[PDB]
Amino acid sequence: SANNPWTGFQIFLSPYYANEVAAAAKQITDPTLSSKAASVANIPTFTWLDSVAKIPDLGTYLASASALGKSTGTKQLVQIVIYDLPDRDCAAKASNGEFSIANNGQANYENYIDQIVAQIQQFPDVRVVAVIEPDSLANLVTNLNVQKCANAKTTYLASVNYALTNLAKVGVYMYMDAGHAGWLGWPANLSPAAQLFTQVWQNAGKSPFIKGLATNVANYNALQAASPDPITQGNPNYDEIHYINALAPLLQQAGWDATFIVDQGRSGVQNIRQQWGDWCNIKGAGFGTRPTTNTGSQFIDSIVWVKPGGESCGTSNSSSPRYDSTCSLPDAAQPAPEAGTWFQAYFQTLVSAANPPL
Ligand SMILES: *[C@@H]1O[C@H](CO)[C@@H](O[C@@H]2O[C@H](CO)[C@@H](O[C@H]3O[C@H](CO)[C@@H](O)[C@H](O)[C@@H]3O)[C@H](O)[C@H]2NC(C)=O)[C@H](O)[C@H]1NC(C)=O
Ligand SMILES: OC[C@H]1O[C@@H](O[C@H]2[C@H](O)[C@@H](O)[C@H](O)O[C@@H]2CO)[C@H](O)[C@@H](O)[C@@H]1O
Ligand SMILES: OC[C@H]1O[C@@H](O)[C@H](O)[C@@H](O)[C@@H]1O
Structure with a gap:
């Protein structure tokens, strides 16, 4: 549309990802x-605010970006992921989220949002x-028959609503996560997805x-594939461009002239999965x-890099309390360390297999 958030701005580079990469x-x-x-x-990559412990980091990035913009004559832009819902990842075998619905999770999540807003408010430039x-x-x-998801539904909707409503008050440009072509891009899922996003x-x-x-956050789909990945059989929307070309008009019809961002940070190599739903550390x-x-x-x-490749x-x-068996599938690079921590061999291959080359 007329206002692309990135036009006229210089993206602030993550010093944390920068520190991980340098090491x-x-x-x-x-x-x-x-x-x-x-x-x-x-x-440029996205900073994941995956816990309250990450909020102090956010504050330093805003202030640093502000100073860098003044030192270079640029307007600066900081890229973040809001990722701390109560009962997070309801359909996963294991979740690392620090909040639970049963322990005031929504209230704790709303305080997490308040702390983020309080940082962002101080750095309006x-x-x-x-x-x-x-x-x-x-x-x-698609997962309302997972009891934890059914049990999380009202909290997810209320918490996401609180995030959208309050981050908007400080002028944050926001993209709701919408899965990927192999999740919500199936033609039959496009309308229930549009109805849910529109209600939100x-x-x-x-x-x-x-x-x-x-779309494609932390996933591996092509934006545009000349030949469909075999994992996509049965879905005519075999890449992200097909998915987005199909969903966008449904949102527009509702009066939402929606635009999209697409993660491509780990998409340089196609045709690496046995099944489309295999998502963990794909080799x-x-x-x-x-x-x-x-x-x-x-x-x-x-096009963005949301998931930071190498984490x-x-x-x-299989003995860890946070073990998700998807991460031991044959197409998952193994052995792999705990979620979020650095996976050096994976990063080196991400570099070696980069397409376009680095
Ligand atoms: C795979 O899963 C296990 C994680 O649950 C892990 O085994 C466990 O590792 C910890 C750390 O050594 C041990 O906990 C220790 O905690 C205190 C430290 O303050 C020590 O004083 C204790 O002696 C205790 O050893 C667990 O005992 C240990 N559990 C078992 C059954 O072995 C494995 O190391 C993980 N393996 C890999 C490759 O990640
Ligand atoms: O896309 C990354 C994201 O995948 C999540 O699992 C999805 C998967 O992407 C999809 O292909 C399949 O159809 O459904 C599952 C959920 O059941 C995964 O839970 C996330 O951890 C991951 O970030
Ligand atoms: O989105 C960031 C922009 O928001 C506006 O409210 C501020 O006045 C600008 O200085 C800033 O560049």
Whole structure:
């Protein structure tokens, strides 16, 4: 649309991902590969506010971005993920979320939002783009027969509404997570998804700051594939562009001129999954298309790197309390460390298999 959040702004690079990458690159032995790995710290990515413990980090990024903009004559933009719902990841075998519905989880989540808003409010010369709650609303389209999801539904909707309503008050541009082509892009899922997202947008007052939806977050789908990945058989929407081209008109019909962002951070290598639903640490993944507003789609504001490649999606250790068995499938790189922690061998392959090359 007319207002693409990224136009006219310089993205603030994550110093934390930058710190992870710098430490990772010096351990890569081939000198040509190590220098390519180091350059990954210059590629814009999203900061995951996966716990209240991450909020102080957010505050430093806003203030730093503000100072960098003044030092360079630029307007700065900070990219974040809101990812702390109570009973988070309701359909997963295991979740790392710190809040539970049964222990005032919604109230604790709303205080988490309040703390984030209180940071953002202090730095009005820094633009913020937020992805809202990966692995939440999508579960409420297709996974209502999972008891935890049925039991989480009202809390997910209330908590996401609180996030949208209150982040809008400080001018945050927001994209609700909307799964990916293999999740909500099945033709039969497009209408229930649109109905849910539209109800969410309406409950939050149709704020213009609610730009639309984020897709492929932490996944591996192509934006545009010349040949469908065999995992996609039965779904004519075999890539993200097909999914977005199908869903967007349903949102527009409701009066929401929605736009989209698409994660491509681990999409450089296609045809690496046995089944489409295999999501954990998929072996052989490569860094994908670099972030850009040159998307070639009327509906897509930016290609982005939301999931930071190299941070594990979960342990393959079946004895860990956080073990998700998806992370031990044959197509999951193993052994793998606990979710969020650095997975050095995975990062090195992401670098080696990057497409376009680094
Ligand atoms: C795979 O899963 C296990 C994690 O649940 C882990 O085994 C456990 O590792 C911890 C850390 O060594 C041990 O807990 C220790 O905690 C205190 C430290 O303050 C020590 O004083 C205790 O002696 C205790 O050892 C657990 O005992 C241990 N549990 C078992 C059954 O072995 C494995 O290490 C994990 N393996 C990998 C590769 O990740
Ligand atoms: O896309 C990353 C995201 O996947 C989640 O699992 C989805 C999966 O993407 C989808 O293909 C399948 O159809 O449904 C599952 C949920 O049942 C996963 O739970 C997340 O941890 C992950 O971030
Ligand atoms: O989105 C960020 C923008 O929000 C506006 O309210 C501020 O006045 C601008 O300085 C800032 O660049």
